[PDB]
Design a protein around this ligand. Sequence first.
Ligand code: HEM
Ligand SMILES: CCCCCCCC
Length: 472
Amino acid sequence: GFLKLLRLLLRRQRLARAMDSFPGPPTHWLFGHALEIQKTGSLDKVVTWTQQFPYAHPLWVGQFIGFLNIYEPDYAKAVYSRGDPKAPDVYDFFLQWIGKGLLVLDGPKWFQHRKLLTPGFHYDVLKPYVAIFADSTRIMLEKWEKKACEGKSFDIFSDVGHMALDTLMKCTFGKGHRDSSYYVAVSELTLLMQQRIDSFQYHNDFIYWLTPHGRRFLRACRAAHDHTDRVIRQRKAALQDEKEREKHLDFLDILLDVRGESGVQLSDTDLRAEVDTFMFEGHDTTTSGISWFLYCMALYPEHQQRCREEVREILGDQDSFQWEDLAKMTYLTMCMKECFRLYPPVPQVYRQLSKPVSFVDGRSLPAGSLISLHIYALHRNSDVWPDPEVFDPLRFSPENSSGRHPYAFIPFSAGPRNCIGQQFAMNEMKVVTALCLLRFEFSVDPLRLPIKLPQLVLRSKNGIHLYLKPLG
Ligand code: HEM
Ligand SMILES: CCCCCCCC
């Protein structure tokens, strides 16, 4: 016991000593910066800090843990190109929920899984998914036409979430109620876990699970685990009749190691972790992305009208979009990237340096130091983006992006730990969002504007309330 107290106090002095090269905002004697972080709009407060301290600034939860918040393309590249492990202080809070899956793994075992699961987001696996996206969206759009003609605005986030979760499971988990029960549990898990990240008194494992906060997290963990245990058994059992006919495997079948070709033999815990992991990752983010996009289309009726007639032309007289049609959606894509710049679905990720790093401006950090990549501020950096807060899709035209720094716009991160599902996501969001524009015209609700709420992914304190006009 005495050993551990000392272990921590030295680590904090170390972390502090390594960022003395980095000025930053004032620290409360107990809370560090937590009182600023916990305020509504703290993302914009970090953006102002960005302009007062260039490249990076220290960031403390509560006097024991301090990160170097980084928000500059060279600083990002210096760190996120290399593959240092995920910050244990943050990602260990995943353990009771998603465990040591791909997101949290740190080393040669991560590369094994990454090598195993990358096939499965290859475009030959994703080509059939286009039909499924279209079907899932048509169900959601059927409900929205009833809501629209009621004349009231309504929150689209939960509806998109239920559609995202359903399409994920039809595409990658074998699916051909209790699902809603899972959806509500993710909400609790991400809410609670985000609050744990921001609340230093909840950091210690032993203490945390004596608190109502931690117990509530554990009840949601069980709720999540029941869901993924059912998904696994349902598939294992469905492969008694249909194994011959499927044999380019989808994600869950790869894990189940049909054909014995994977040759890595996953444990039951490792299998359940990856299912847990990709079940959070493959729906929560695209829910945020799609929802925030449709809001952007409402905020800027010129841009969505352009997107609408673009996809209207691409579709023509087809029944549904084909995988080949997704490339033609060049203007939809640029509006989407500009949405993700301002409304990045994952605002903040973290690493713990395994090796020292030296930055472009001369400063450096030793191994063991904690990094906080602030994608939100990075995407609003005034030294990189003229008129940062302005929404201009033409920033991502072929001309204006030709010589842009590679780590300037990284909503899917970058490097060896980049998003594995990026092309899954991009394909899904383009199909969903294109069919949304062919079917409705979206407009703000001036009384109920969204307020940004970090919740691991980017959510809104009050949903995304929109008015929908049906279309011929
Ligand atoms: C799983 C999964 C990973 C981890 C890959 C690995 O560790 O090999 C992943 C990564 C990311 C990251 C980096 C996370 C970090 O730095 O801690 C970001 C920022 C991000 C963002 C988005 N992702 Fe993702 N992603 C994983 C899974 C998925 C899936 C699953 C099928 C989809 C779909 C997807 C989509 C998106 C997305 C879409 C709007 C954003 C933003 N990710 N991912
Ligand atoms: C610390 C938040 C990590 C969220 C990553 C989600 C990847 C889809």
